[PDB]
Every structure is written in C-alpha cells, then in structure tokens.
C-alpha cells in the first residue's frame, strides 16, 4: 500500500531477502516486524532491513 525509499545499496544475504539499490522506490508489503520489512523491488519480493529504508 505504501512506498519506501531505499537509503542504501543492500545485497540480499538469504533466499527470503531481496536486493535493492540506493534510491530505489519499493512497495511496502508487510512492516509488522520491527527489523525486517517485506517489500517489492521491481518485480521481486522479499525482505530487507527496516533500518535501510524510509517510509514515504
Ligand atoms: Na534472496
Ligand atoms: Na526505516
């Protein structure tokens, strides 16, 4: 529903994670966890650290 901004480059470390580039605009899918948010990066879905993204 919401959009988030990738504040840093982040390379996924596990299958459930996804990679993002600084400045990417991600779709926020699930932010119920305080440390890991599920996002859509382009056509991929996965988790990134909440600390590395900013809600828009
Ligand atoms: Na992955
Ligand atoms: Na954040």
UniProtKB/Swiss-Prot annotation:
Annotated SH3 domain residues: 1-56
Segments traversing the membrane: none
Subcellular location(s) of the protein: Cytoplasm, Cytoskeleton; Cytoplasm, Cell cortex
Signal peptide, first to last residue: none
Superkingdom in the source lineage: Eukaryota
Subunit field text: Like erythrocyte spectrin, the spectrin-like proteins are capable of forming dimers which can further associate to tetramers. Interacts with ACP1.
Entry similarity comment: Belongs to the spectrin family.
Protein's job: Morphologically, spectrin-like proteins appear to be related to spectrin, showing a flexible rod-like structure. They can bind actin but seem to differ in their calmodulin-binding activity. In nonerythroid tissues, spectrins, in association with some other proteins, may play an important role in membrane organization.
Protein name: Spectrin alpha chain, non-erythrocytic 1
């Amino acid at each position: 529903k919401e959009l988030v901004l990738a504040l840093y480059d982040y390379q996924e470390k596990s299958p459930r994670e996804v990679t993002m580039k600084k400045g990417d605009i991600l779709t926020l899918l699930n932010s119920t966890n305080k440390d890991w948010w599920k996002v859509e990066v382009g056509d991929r879905q996965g988790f990134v650290p909440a600390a590395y993204v900013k809600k828009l």
